[PDB]
């Protein structure tokens, strides 16, 4: 053992609790998504590596039930992630956090991000020229927003929203509200 | 090796890398602040145990600069959080994330939370009679919102906002915007 690697673990934890809790930078948060994605098989492999050395019985019928639970829920959620990939053919359906997606037409193409709420009203704020909709920095936009965005969740929830009210604040900024006007089942 | 105490660690990591973002439940979000608060004077005293042993000075001298890194930001941040307390006599000035506060008058008293941005426009959404301003669930509210909310800083400035536009949606819900109209430096 050495009292240096533990220090680097304890230091990498503060940096994950501070900066990872933000979606306001694209190429900063997919890395955290990948880390959380990879943490799942490591735990199951560690747990199954304790039920084969079932000495003292504390490594026996305890490291078997939890192995079942953690190997069960992982499949139960991978199934849902693949089903979400089926409808919306996007590589965003494999994030280990949610199963709801938000689509925003911008600059010719469409920008897709994961969402956590699926509520009735969605707020949009343009600060200095950059758009920040739902805890997500979504690039560059003047007040030329879209009059219709969509939120998709596998098995129903093709919900179409609508620009209900927009306004301009001093010289660069503005706000807008999207009120859900249509629902679509699958 | 004891492969039963390691899976219990990765499971806790998967648990806290999943539910620690939401600031909605108060009695679930106050605990994360305490846990993150305790990690500084643990890392600080976990890097020092590599100067007690000091085996190889090419590997025992790294934890001198490293322990001089996190013994220096810790003071220069507690100092600032205490000043946030000094102006605003609140107990939210001691969370280890930000150094800006948000004040919302509600049901007679004031509801205070920590805020991270201090932008020019602030959004507010009422869903089913519950108010949600900046990632915090502030309680219960009809459309009886306030024409003035206040964002506070350590020494920076007091910044009063103003109800610029509100709209009722679906007999219970609503959207509102607070466009900054005033700024006051202490």
């Amino acid at each position, epitope marked *: 053992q050495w009292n240096l690697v533990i220090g680097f673990l304890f230091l990498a934890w503060i940096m994950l609790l501070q900066f990872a809790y933000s979606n306001r930078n694209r190429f900063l948060y997919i890395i955290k998504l990948v880390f959380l994605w990879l943490l799942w098989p490591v735990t199951l492999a560690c747990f199954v590596l304790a039920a084969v050395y079932r000495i003292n019985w504390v490594t026996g019928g305890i490291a078997i039930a939890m192995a079942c639970i953690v190997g069960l829920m992982w499949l139960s959620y991978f199934v849902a992630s693949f089903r979400l990939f089926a409808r919306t053919r996007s590589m965003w359906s494999f994030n280990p956090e949610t199963n709801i997606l938000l689509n925003v037409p911008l600059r010719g193409t*469409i920008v897709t991000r994961p969402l956590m709420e699926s509520e009735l009203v969605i707020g949009a704020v343009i600060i200095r020229g950059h758009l920040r909709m739902a805890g997500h920095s979504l690039g560059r936009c003047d007040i030329k927003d*879209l009059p219709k965005e969509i939120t998709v969740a596998t098995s129903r929830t093709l919900s179409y929203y609508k620009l209900g009210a927009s306004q301009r604040v001093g010289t660069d900024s503005g706000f807008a509200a999207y009120n859900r*006007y249509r*629902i679509g089942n699958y | 090796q004891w492969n039963l105490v390691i899976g219990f660690l990765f499971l806790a990591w998967i648990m806290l890398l999943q539910f620690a973002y939401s600031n909605r439940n108060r009695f679930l979000y106050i605990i994360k602040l305490v846990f993150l608060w305790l990690l500084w004077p643990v890392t600080l005293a976990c890097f020092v145990l590599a100067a007690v042993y000091r085996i190889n000075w090419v590997t025992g001298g790294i934890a001198i600069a490293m322990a001089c890194i996190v013994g220096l930001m810790w003071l220069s941040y507690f100092v600032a959080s205490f000043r946030l307390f000094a102006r605003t006599r609140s107990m939210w000035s001691f969370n280890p994330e930000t150094n800006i506060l948000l004040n919302v008058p509600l049901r007679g008293t004031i509801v205070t939370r920590p805020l991270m941005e201090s932008e020019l426009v602030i959004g507010a959404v009422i869903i089913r009679g519950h108010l949600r301003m900046a990632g915090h669930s502030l309680g219960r509210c009809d459309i009886k919102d306030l024409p003035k909310e206040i964002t506070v800083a350590t020494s920076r400035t007091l910044s009063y906002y103003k109800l610029g536009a509100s709209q009722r949606v679906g007999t*219970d819900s609503g959207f509102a915007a607070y466009n900054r109209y005033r700024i006051g430096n202490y």
Partner: antibody
Amino acid sequence: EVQLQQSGPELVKPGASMKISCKTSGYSFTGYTMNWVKQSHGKNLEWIGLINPYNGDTSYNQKFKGKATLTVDKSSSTAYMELLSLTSEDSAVYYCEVINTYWGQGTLVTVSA
Amino acid sequence: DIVMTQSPASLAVSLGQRATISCKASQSIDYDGDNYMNWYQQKPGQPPKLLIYTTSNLESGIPARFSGSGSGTDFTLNIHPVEEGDAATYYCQQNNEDPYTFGGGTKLEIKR
């Protein structure tokens, strides 16, 4: 600002097929959904179908299925409805809409010998 | 295949008086506690235009004289200060289910 120009009226015999072409302008062609309406003889609004110009993913009701094909040309910013096996009950004023706010001017389809 | 009906076939309303149109639905909608209903207006020779969405949300550009309300399976459109230009046919739409349906349409006539 936003325009949905129609191709104009046309007359065909029973059993014929045709293509209603709608040309849009004022905005980026993809990103907004397309809806079609029939408004048969009289004053009765109806829903035919809904399509996404960006990737397809069409949706119909159970009454107009097999009677129309909805497609898109991204190169001309155009949307098409193919009317199949037209009969005497198909003569109507068909037109496109986007988000229940903007409508085309109406294409008059007459089915008669 | 959700059916919606409007009670009056037509209205004869003098200037300055209130006009009312009612509609009933076979389904309660009740999606997350929110009802859905769209009110449309059409004039001769023109395509329709949207007036009210989600049972109470006034469309931008529509005067406040048009007030929509209701709940459950009962929906009502109120036009209080009826003027001489309010001569058109008004429609309802569910905007809730994949087989989207429209109402029959009620014609508004003005007395003189």
